[PDB]
């Protein structure tokens, strides 16, 4: 058995069962178990029609005393003494356990001891009235209770499988819809947040700029040079537009500017990331002072260590005097 414990102790305040039985101590004793009456063939008490007419019970409501929660039971775990009280079997008291072995109640006068002790087998004691009280169920479903014989559908009924699978299908249908909504919503939270999406769009008010002026906008962490180009600057890049293929990174000004008057570029030197300064260099474009890279008026590398042209960001013209970076 699993780890288990019983309260088989010698109490300081509660007597053992041999000393004070808590059950109704009237039993009938036979010589052989076959001499007991048969409950199934024994007439029971006459049925009553009112709950107030039901018979009385032999139990004593006040069998136990003292502080504690109320309880009615017949048995305890306490240990018995080696010299237990001698039971009065003549009056009907039960003799089983220590009160038989460690006493001389079993002794008759002239009967062979083997026969005398045979009678006090526990199978020979049954409570008075066992055969007239103990229920003998013939079924777990008493008469008047609903069962399959009353709920069976008529034989002309319609198939119930189709609707059953519709109901279990609907449980799955709704469950899958709730599952998809949950998953998508959680993944959606990883998208750039409302503050970040908002900050990732800067609008350039081309209103107030003067031809030849270069301004810087911090867009997505990087400097974005936005320069209005004078006709001289525009013509200069157009002149190099013919000498294309003589440049480290051949690109035409038309493919780097959406409007000739406006050059929007990311101001990050393609060599080692330094930010170039405008109106500097040999081409009057943008000169990175770190290692000496010269870019033209279109942002194309013309001299220095830098390998490529300054990148053109993603930007569109909302109107004639506004750009939207992103």
């Amino acid at each position: 058995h699993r780890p288990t414990t019983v309260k088989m102790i010698d109490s300081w305040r509660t007597e053992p069962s041999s000393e004070k039985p808590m059950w109704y101590n009237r039993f009938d004793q036979v010589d052989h178990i076959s001499q007991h009456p048969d409950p199934e063939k024994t007439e029971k008490y006459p049925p009553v029609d009112d709950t107030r007419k039901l018979m009385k019970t032999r139990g004593d409501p006040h069998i136990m005393r003292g502080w504690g929660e109320y309880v009615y039971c017949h048995y305890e775990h306490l240990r018995e003494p080696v010299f237990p009280r001698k039971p009065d079997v003549a009056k009907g008291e039960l003799a089983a356990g220590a009160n038989v072995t460690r006493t001389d109640v079993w002794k008759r006068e002239g009967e062979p001891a083997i026969q005398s002790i045979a009678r006090f087998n526990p199978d020979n004691f049954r409570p008075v009235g066992y055969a007239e009280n103990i229920p003998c169920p013939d079924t777990c479903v008493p008469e008047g209770h609903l069962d399959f014989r009353h709920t069976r559908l008529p034989t002309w009924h319609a198939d119930r499988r189709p609707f059953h699978y519709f109901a279990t299908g609907m449980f799955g249908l709704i469950g899958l819809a709730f599952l998809r909504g949950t998953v998508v919503k959680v993944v959606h939270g990883l998208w750039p947040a409302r503050d970040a999406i908002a900050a990732g769009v800067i609008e350039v008010d081309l209103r107030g700029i003067q031809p030849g002026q270069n301004f810087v906008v911090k867009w997505r962490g990087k400097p974005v040079f936005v320069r209005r180009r004078t006709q001289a600057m525009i013509d200069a890049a157009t002149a190099d537009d013919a000498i294309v293929n003589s440049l480290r990174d051949p690109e035409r000004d038309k493919d780097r500017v959406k409007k000739p008057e406006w050059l929007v570029m990311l101001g990050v030197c393609t060599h080692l990331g330094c930010v170039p300064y405008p109106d500097q260099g040999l081409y009057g474009g943008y000169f990175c002072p770190c290692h000496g890279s010269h870019y033209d008026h279109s942002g194309r590398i013309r001299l220095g260590p830098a390998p490529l042209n300054m990148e053109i960001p993603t930007y569109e013209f909302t109107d004639d005097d506004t750009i939207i970076l992103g």
Binding site: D138, C140, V141, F148, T151, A167, M170, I174, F178
Partner: protein
């Protein structure tokens, strides 16, 4: 001894399928900008929160551009000043709490970003507090700068009665009276606390109704399978077919 509990005002948004009343929210912001903003700050409310929810984008740009924000550093390491934009929070009247206390006789006007839900009674507390300014109870004398409000804990608040009839002119033409302004600002501050309030309830409506249909399906399934069990007949000395 706990502060008097506010009454239950019948705001539109209290019902299960009701939204924030946008026209009232618009009027509420006007009250906050022109009355409450002088002493209080809304640190966690940004102009972009109002775009396409309370006001159109162009209008919110004008509101933000009205204020000036210290920004920087520039290339010379100096801090400059610029007009506001959609990314800025609502302006703060004072640079720090010590400055606020000094200008308000040692009382600190709390930030109103979450005050709509920070008191027992919630939105009702704001509406009741603004309209809860009565003459002092007989036998109670208040030191100068303290006023009697039935709902403020203790009864004496360092806030002057902020709402007076005709204080502002509503753009929509609604009559400007103290009770109207209290109702509107209470509405607006409730929105500011949880701008996703309408989204929560609309999605909740779909979930709750769907959950009822889901309950019916599992109930039919539960009834079906347990019929096998609850109608069985176990016999011992009897047999019926």
């Amino acid at each position: 001894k706990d502060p008097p509990s506010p009454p239950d005002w019948p705001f539109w948004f209290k019902a299960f399928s009701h939204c924030h009343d946008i026209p009232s929210c618009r009027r509420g912001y006007e009250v906050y900008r022109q009355v409450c903003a002088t002493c209080h700050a809304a640190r966690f409310v940004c102009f972009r929160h109002m775009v396409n929810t309370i006001y159109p984008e162009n209008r919110v740009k004008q509101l933000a551009a009205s204020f000036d924000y210290e920004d920087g550093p520039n290339d010379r390491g100096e801090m400059f000043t610029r007009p506001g934009n959609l990314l800025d929070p609502f302006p703060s009247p004072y640079p720090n709490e010590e400055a606020a206390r000094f200008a308000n006789q040692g009382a600190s006007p709390p930030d109103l970003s979450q005050q709509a839900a920070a008191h027992h009674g919630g939105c009702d507390y704001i509406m009741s507090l603004l309209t809860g300014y009565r003459d002092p109870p007989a036998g109670v004398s208040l030191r100068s700068g303290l006023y009697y409000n039935t709902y403020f804990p203790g009864g004496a608040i360092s806030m002057p009665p902020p709402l007076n009839d005709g204080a502002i002119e509503y753009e929509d033409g609604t009559p400007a009276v103290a009770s109207q302004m209290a109702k509107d600002v209470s509405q607006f501050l409730t929105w500011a606390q949880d701008p996703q309030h309408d989204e929560r309830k609309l999605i909740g409506l779909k979930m709750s109704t769907a959950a009822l249909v889901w309950l019916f399906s599992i109930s039919v399934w539960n009834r079906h399978v347990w019929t096998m069990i609850k109608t069985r007949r176990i016999d011992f000395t009897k047999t019926v077919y």
